[PDB]
């Protein structure tokens, strides 16, 4: 989970640089000392985005490194090649698994979880807020930060499904990742899918309840407009296909769970399309109405970012272990201790 968070962060974080068209001046959004004496505006939501993605990237990297230090200590201790033992050695920093070191380990890991838990909610609230502070009718919606947070957990749980069913099957980790693991993960995805469907209802209620023409034409152009195909595929994907996950046999069925997670990811992408592109298509002045058609280069960059993600994931599953070796030994201890005290 930490690894694909870092790799999705590396895939995402190129896009604020890449979408500029003067991308070599990306550091101008960063407050840096210059001879000009200028500053970032700091009330823009892209100015919040730069701090947000940088802090999120750094904290997720920090959590990965402290989560990796004792597994580095094990991999140094079993490497059997002399030069690789130094390489995992300075990676482990000579971790020396011990009390008065494990105390600070659990203490700092629980506390960093306490730092990163509000943080990822806020960083995806700020990814929401780059639409939610804007005056576009489909973008100025007050539900957007918890709704984008729920959509993010929903799409991410889809991706963790789609990339851990092969890790469970092909690499023989069936005992470590049981079927109850996938059951509870489908349950949490079901929770976030209901909150996302509730967010769609909130959008429909905002457009119907309001007497404004612009919210009503938003709902019309989403429902019956030229780009209305994405909204119909959104209610087919992210709403109809999630009601299967209420039943346990659907959750325990591995091919059904994989394919429903794939529909979650595609319809989540469709939700971002409906939020951004469709609301930018038709605006306040009808002279400023135009269709958006992607080129081959948008899809080329999307497939290429899939390549960067999968490449970094494959180096991760090669040089480093993909399951926490410690905290599974601790989980083994906790399981046999529950089996002791009953």
């Amino acid at each position: 989970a930490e690894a694909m968070t870092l790799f999705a962060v590396a895939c995402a974080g190129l896009y604020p640089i890449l979408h500029l068209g003067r991308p070599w001046l990306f550091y101008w959004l960063i407050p840096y000392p210059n001879t000009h004496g200028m500053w970032p505006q700091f009330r823009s939501a892209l100015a919040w985005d730069v701090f947000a993605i940088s802090t999120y990237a750094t904290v997720s990297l920090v959590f990965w490194l402290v989560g990796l230090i004792p597994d580095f200590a094990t991999l140094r201790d079993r490497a059997k090649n002399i030069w690789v033992k130094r390489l995992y050695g300075i990676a482990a920093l000579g971790w020396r698994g011990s009390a008065r070191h494990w105390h600070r380990y659990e203490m700092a890991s629980i506390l960093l979880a306490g730092l990163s838990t509000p943080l990822v909610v806020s960083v995806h609230s700020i990814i929401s807020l780059d639409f939610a502070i804007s005056q576009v009718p489909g973008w100025q919606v007050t539900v957007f930060p918890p709704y984008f947070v729920a959509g993010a957990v929903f799409a991410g749980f889809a991706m963790v499904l789609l990339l851990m069913i092969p890790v469970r099957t092909f690499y023989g980790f069936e005992n470590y990742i049981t079927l109850h693991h996938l059951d509870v993960m489908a349950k949490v995805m079901l929770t976030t899918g209901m909150i996302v469907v509730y967010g769609y209802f909130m959008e429909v209620f905002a457009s119907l309840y309001s007497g404004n023409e612009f919210e009503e034409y938003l709902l019309y152009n989403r429902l019956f407009g030229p780009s209305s195909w994405a909204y119909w595929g959104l209610l087919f994907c992210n709403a109809v296909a999630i009601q299967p996950l209420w039943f346990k046999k659907v959750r325990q069925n591995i091919p059904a769970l994989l394919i429903i997670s794939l529909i979650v990811s595609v319809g989540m992408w469709l939700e971002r399309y409906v939020i951004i592109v469709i609301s930018l298509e038709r605006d306040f002045l009808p002279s400023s109405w135009d269709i958006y058609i992607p080129t081959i280069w948008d899809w080329s960059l999307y497939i290429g970012t899939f390549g960067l993600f999968f490449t970094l994931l494959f180096l991760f599953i090669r040089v480093l272990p993909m399951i926490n070796i410690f905290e599974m030994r601790l989980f083994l201890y906790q399981e046999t201790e529950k089996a002791k005290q009953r």
């Binding site: 001879t35 000009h36 004496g37 200028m38």
Partner: protein
């Protein structure tokens, strides 16, 4: 150094446009030829100057003070509002070959556009670089700022002041 401190020509003789336009006039060949058709022509240091004014090709001078061309400096409003040369160019009157005195930053330009009292002078913008800023530069600067109508820094640090 030889023309202004020694021979003694005022800078509006050659830069004739310094108080009318944004562009202080770069001197033509004819400006040299009022003197140098008689003051040692057939000299090796002036074969380019005598190559011009016979054929029409300009003497290709090299720009010393250079702005990046969307900054839009105006010379006339600086000399007219009591800012003389040698606050922005240094003592050019002593320069045998001219160097840039400081880098033309937004720091330097916004420094005078935020505190114009430190460098403003009681007119005499085009006076030779024998001028020295007095001790009461805060006092005489505030009086000259209020006297010339130098606007508040909330107006002079606007972006469409310089960039356009």
């Amino acid at each position: 150094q030889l023309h202004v401190n020694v021979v003694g020509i005022d800078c509006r003789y050659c830069h004739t446009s310094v108080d009318q336009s944004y562009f202080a006039n770069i001197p033509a060949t004819e400006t040299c030829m009022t003197c140098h058709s008689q003051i040692k022509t057939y000299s090796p240091l002036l074969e380019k100057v005598r190559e011009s004014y016979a054929t029409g090709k300009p003497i290709e001078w090299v720009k010393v003070y250079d702005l990046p061309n969307f900054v839009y400096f105006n010379h006339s409003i600086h000399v007219n509002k009591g800012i003389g040369c040698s606050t922005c160019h240094g003592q050019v009157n002593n320069m045998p070959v001219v160097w840039q005195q400081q880098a033309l930053y937004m720091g330097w330009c916004l420094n005078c556009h935020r505190n114009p009292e430190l460098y403003v002078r009681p007119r005499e913008e085009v006076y030779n670089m024998d001028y020295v800023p007095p001790s009461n530069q805060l006092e005489i600067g505030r009086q000259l700022v209020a006297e010339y109508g130098i606007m508040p820094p909330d107006q002079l640090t606007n972006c469409y002041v310089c960039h356009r």
